[PDB]
Amino acid sequence: MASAEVVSKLEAAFAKLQNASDCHSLLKKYLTKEVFDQLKGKQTKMGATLMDVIQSGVENLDSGIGVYAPDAESYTLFAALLDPIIEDYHKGFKPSDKQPPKDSGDLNTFIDVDPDKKYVISTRVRCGRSLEGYPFNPCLKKQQYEEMESRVKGQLESMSGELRGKYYPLTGMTKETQKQLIDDHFLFKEGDRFLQAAHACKFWPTGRGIYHNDAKTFLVWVNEEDHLRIISMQKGGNLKEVFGRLVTAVGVIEEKVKFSRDDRLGFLTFCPTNLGTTIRASVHIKLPRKKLEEVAAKYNLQVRGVYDISNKRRLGLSEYEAVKEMQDGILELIKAEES
Template sequence: MAHHVSIQACIEQLDVEIGFRATDPDAYVTFGALFDPAIKDYHKIPMNADIRHPSPSFGSVDDLDIKDLDPDGKYVISTRVRVGRNLDGFPFQSLLSDDERAKVETRLKNTFGQLQLVKEYDGEYHSLETMTEAEEKNLIETHLLFNHSNSASRSAGVYRNWPMNRGIYINKTKTFLVWISETDHTRIISMQPGGRIDQVYSRLVEGVRIIEKQLRFAHSDRLGYITFCPTNLGTTLRASVHIKIPKLAANKEVLGKLCDDYNLQVRGIDGDGTGIFGDTFDISNKRRMGLTEIQAVVEMAAGVKAIINEEENL
């Protein structure tokens, strides 16, 4: 089987941070000379032949020094933790055939029966192919559903034959989501209003465990869980808050330094590739590789707490 790397994003989108994508798990081996320097720079880890990503370790909420990021409810609007996964034995989105995408959807949908047996995760699947325009618009505006507006993903071929075999599983309380065929084969997401990172994280962990008992995902000792974009390798975990910080919004140099110090990423609240406007930001851990899942959440929590402290002191 021939392996490929997608470089179209860096040709068409000159401002993208990393413009090349893997088209299957083996691309990271075949094109290691291209990927390794980018991985080293983004995740701040050495990349040599002996590098090994830590074994998955979700730990426990007892390992979190900070369980509520914003006890007074003054700054954090919502908290979200997600992981990405790709089914073992399938190429990634830019090479996935229509038949393969249908198989990915079927296999993931088959896991939802087990989720529905647990009260907290009980919900239903919504196909993008059958939902109305109004339903789709509402789910996107409430930050539950992905869209196909990311220019780098479009350049890389992620959105071919949209919206075929794509959809979202939503639990009844809208605090647990499973996306099918957005960028990776699936994104598993836990979210809720406010800053209770302990509740959000524990819900994610148990949901991931239910799904992973039923499916085998692409993984290697060297890179951890393997994803379409090199920024998401390793734990693939992104813990984030939507946070309103008007004083720091007017002091972006101070905010930027805090984010650098705590390995945080800032972006707009409407998702990857969106602009940053006003005084409300999406802030998350930047490093996903070279540390465990619980360590990534701890790093994010410490950084958000430091940002809130700075906001109060300005």
């Protein structure tokens, strides 16, 4: 399937990896000679090769992960490399393990986690989606950037009610709009060296754009890293409202634009660290030893005094369970704080 020249270039890439003793990416760990020989000759129907999976990790030897998926099929075709990487990164996600069915659960079990208004500045839930039938960034053509943006923009501009808002393409975006979106923290620009070496940012800014609702409690980035990054957010701690709005908005997009989902991996994403639910649920929280990392770890939460605290787990649990882990963690952090 892959040409002789792709294979030659892959041989050169593998030698570069093997030479690099200082490299400890998951790429380096799991791209064994055996796995490399098994996979080097394969090519997906959309035309992706092992080079389109591993090139960022070969160019940026200091990558943590060092692989991206160039299309949905890659997760199946290059599984001998991708599966042990996913399993390494998503701790506790075993080979016999599977993403559960999609389930956002009972929304009225979500609460305002800070009804006294003392700790939580704002609450955010983000997810991402790839659209069915399109390659991911490393392999998108310019026409495909444009078509996808048009399809997406259509749905977003159809939104009404609390979701009513405006789509801003990066293509022809004025200085005024740039400034305004920067002020909202809504602007993105071309990717860093990890994305660039993945060929994730070609034809910039074609097919890239930003949508937000009038209330500024809902934001979509089109073609930034994934086809879609979809975010709901507001001031205060009402996780119910934040997550309910996300579920609603994603359903509206999906009315016309179908997403790429795997039975085992859930929603397929450009970076394997985003698989499964794709969900990152967080609060910006004021919590004045560091028995902060004690509690946080017990409740599977990441802490990145004003903190940004989010769920660690994205794969091997439902959407509901992911947002619910953040809820439980935060309530327990607030209880720890008040002792």
